[PDB]
């Protein structure tokens, strides 16, 4: 994902975001494995905490305005979409994850092309229908859908 004809700094930022994208994907996949393992085996002690563990790192990157271009250009939002998706048993990620991700989306200059490559629009719509979503986060989702379906 790094651009060969960019200088070291630009490659360094692309790498930072590409590393984060992979770490987010590993964390989501490990939590999914845990929740399938929790189903196949009915072991009730099993909880999915890899996304929650990595969240401060994700929030720190998402909240830096000077990283917006790099975030958007490298499709990090695809990993955000994956973090918001219901899990195999229909359960949502933790409130802290939902709130932190939506608040960060509110500040990013997301364009149609980014929504297209990430699939982020589709998961945000789900948050406006779900019964398990807190009412304040459903309002935030609706407000994002509205900022993204302007004519």
């Amino acid at each position: 994902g790094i651009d060969p004809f960019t200088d070291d700094l630009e490659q360094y930022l692309d790498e930072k975001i590409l590393r984060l994208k992979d770490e987010m994907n590993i964390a989501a996949q490990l939590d999914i494995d845990t929740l399938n393992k929790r189903i196949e085996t009915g072991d009730t002690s099993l909880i999915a905490m890899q996304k929650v563990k990595l969240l401060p790192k994700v929030v720190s990157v998402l909240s830096k305005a000077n990283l917006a271009d790099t975030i958007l250009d490298n499709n990090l939002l695809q990993s955000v979409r994956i973090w918001l998706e219901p899990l195999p048993d229909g359960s949502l990620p933790s409130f802290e994850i939902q709130k932190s991700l939506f608040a960060a989306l509110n500040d990013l200059p997301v364009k149609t092309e980014h929504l297209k490559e990430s699939g982020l629009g589709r998961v945000v719509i789900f948050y406006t229908k779900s019964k398990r979503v807190e009412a304040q986060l459903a309002r935030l989702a609706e407000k994002l859908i509205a900022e993204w379906t302007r004519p």
């Binding site: 589709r122 998961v123 789900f126 229908k129 779900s130 004519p151």
Partner: peptide, 29 residues
């Protein structure tokens, strides 16, 4: 306004048909 009709199609490009997650919505119910 010239292509404002096309904006519908663009919604569709972003959102699809809306049913990707019906399985999860049905679980809740």
């Amino acid at each position: 306004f010239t292509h404002m009709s096309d904006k519908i199609d663009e919604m569709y490009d972003i959102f699809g048909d809306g049913h990707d997650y019906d399985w999860a919505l049905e679980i809740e119910n």
